[PDB]
Write an enzyme that holds these catalytic residues in place. Structure first.
Site, PDB file in Angstrom:
ATOM      1  N   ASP A  83     -30.257  15.523 -18.340  1.00 10.83           N
ATOM      2  CA  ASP A  83     -29.085  14.692 -18.052  1.00 10.83           C
ATOM      3  C   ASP A  83     -29.310  13.941 -16.742  1.00 10.83           C
ATOM      4  O   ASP A  83     -29.169  14.525 -15.664  1.00 10.83           O
ATOM      5  CB  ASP A  83     -27.828  15.568 -17.998  1.00 10.83           C
ATOM      6  CG  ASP A  83     -26.562  14.771 -17.710  1.00 10.83           C
ATOM      7  OD1 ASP A  83     -26.617  13.532 -17.736  1.00 10.83           O
ATOM      8  OD2 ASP A  83     -25.518  15.402 -17.465  1.00 10.83           O
TER       9      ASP A  83
ATOM     10  N   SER B 201     -27.161  -4.752 -14.611  1.00  8.40           N
ATOM     11  CA  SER B 201     -27.698  -5.541 -15.706  1.00  8.40           C
ATOM     12  C   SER B 201     -27.318  -7.010 -15.536  1.00  8.40           C
ATOM     13  O   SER B 201     -26.237  -7.349 -15.028  1.00  8.40           O
ATOM     14  CB  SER B 201     -27.201  -4.991 -17.048  1.00  8.40           C
ATOM     15  OG  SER B 201     -27.557  -5.864 -18.114  1.00  8.40           O
TER      16      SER B 201
END
Ligand SMILES: NCc1ccc(C(F)(F)F)cc1
EC number: 3.4.23.22
Length: 330
Positions: free
Chosen positions: A35, A199
């Protein structure tokens, strides 16, 4: 030194991936969920309430000649979906794919929430975010990656997740045969403890690319892709019959539809998520409504590039003193 381990989806929807990890001497093998959105290594153990255990393999520190109780230390964790667990803390030897760390903090679950108990295939979590999020008190503990960093050939690990297929986590080296083209690196903010990056935009199907900054975190521990409401609405608008369902808790779509692909920007590069990766199947057995893999982050407060996005790429987690994230097509 280096390490390399195969990671396997737990079911046919790629809801999560498990990776075998050796803990203790002699080794006890547990299947942990790697994770990058958390920073605790916690396991089901011989100390977990017996009613909260349903088929998991348990770590038993009493059978390990290298386990030491970390006197006075506790941990308590709560995840973004409402899960939680807590207990005490041991140190022990931990090996992943041949890479060995001695004196790793292993957090022993005394209590686990119901959602872990129902997931027979996951024996625990191996956190790979930055150590500032580790929940051990009063002395914060380092992650496996942080402990291994000194001895690694290169302070990197890479995530190569498969679509309905096994994949690979590599520690300490970049496999230049696992991707095509070049790796595009982008800056990471560590200020919240996550692998956080920006992004550069998105496109739906074969539409035009919309340049727009989307800040979010690279999280192998989250199944879906959670994006701002404006982006998610523009995607599902291209799917005939798709609608947001309050009773289901997100966008659903007629199982008979074909899903457009989704493109996200990394610097000047583009990563294409095939439409098939966004289908998470019928909401209930026999239903003709299917659950979408792209959902709104409005209720979460942070955008999450989960497995849906990461499995479309080869991903480099560069833990250099100035950290970066690398993306390549594969
Ligand atoms: N995979 C760990 C994780 C879970 C939840 C969150 C949230 F919801 F807080 F963003 C971050 C990281």
């Amino acid at each position: 030194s280096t390490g390399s381990a195969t990671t396997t989806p737990i079911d046919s929807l790629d809801d999560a991936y498990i990776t075998p990890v050796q803990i203790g001497t002699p080794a006890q093998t547990l299947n942990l969920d790697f994770d990058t959105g958390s920073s605790d290594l916690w396991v089901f153990s011989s100390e977990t309430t017996a009613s909260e255990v349903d088929g998991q393999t348990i770590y038993t520190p009493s059978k390990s000649t290298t386990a030491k109780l970390l006197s006075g230390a506790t941990w308590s964790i709560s995840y973004g979906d409402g899960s939680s667990s807590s207990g005490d803390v041991y140190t022990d030897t931990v090996s992943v794919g041949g890479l060995t760390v001695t004196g790793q903090a292993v957090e022993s679950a005394k209590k686990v929430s119901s959602s872990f108990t129902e997931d027979s295939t996951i024996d625990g979590l191996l956190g790979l975010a930055f150590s500032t999020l580790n929940t051990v008190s009063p002395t914060q503990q380092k992650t496996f990656f942080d402990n291994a960093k000194a001895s690694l050939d290169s302070p990197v690990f890479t995530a190569d997740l498969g679509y309905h297929a096994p994949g690979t986590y590599n520690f300490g080296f970049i496999d230049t045969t696992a991707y095509t083209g070049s790796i595009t690196y982008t800056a990471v903010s560590t200020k919240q403890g996550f692998w956080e990056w920006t992004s550069t935009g998105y496109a739906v199907g074969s539409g035009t690319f919309k340049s727009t900054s989307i800040d979010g975190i690279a999280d192998t521990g989250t199944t879906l892709l959670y994006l701002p409401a404006t982006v998610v609405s523009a995607y599902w608008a291209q799917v005939s019959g798709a609608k947001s369902s309050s009773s289901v808790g997100g966008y659903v779509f007629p199982c008979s539809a074909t899903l457009p692909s989704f493109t996200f920007g990394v610097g000047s590069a583009r990563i294409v998520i095939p439409g098939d990766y966004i289908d998470f199947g019928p909401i209930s057995t026999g239903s003709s409504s299917c659950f979408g893999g792209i959902q709104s982050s409005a209720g979460i407060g942070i955008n999450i590039f989960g497995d849906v996005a990461l499995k479309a790429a080869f991903v480099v987690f560069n833990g250099a003193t100035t950290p970066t994230l690398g993306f390549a097509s594969k």
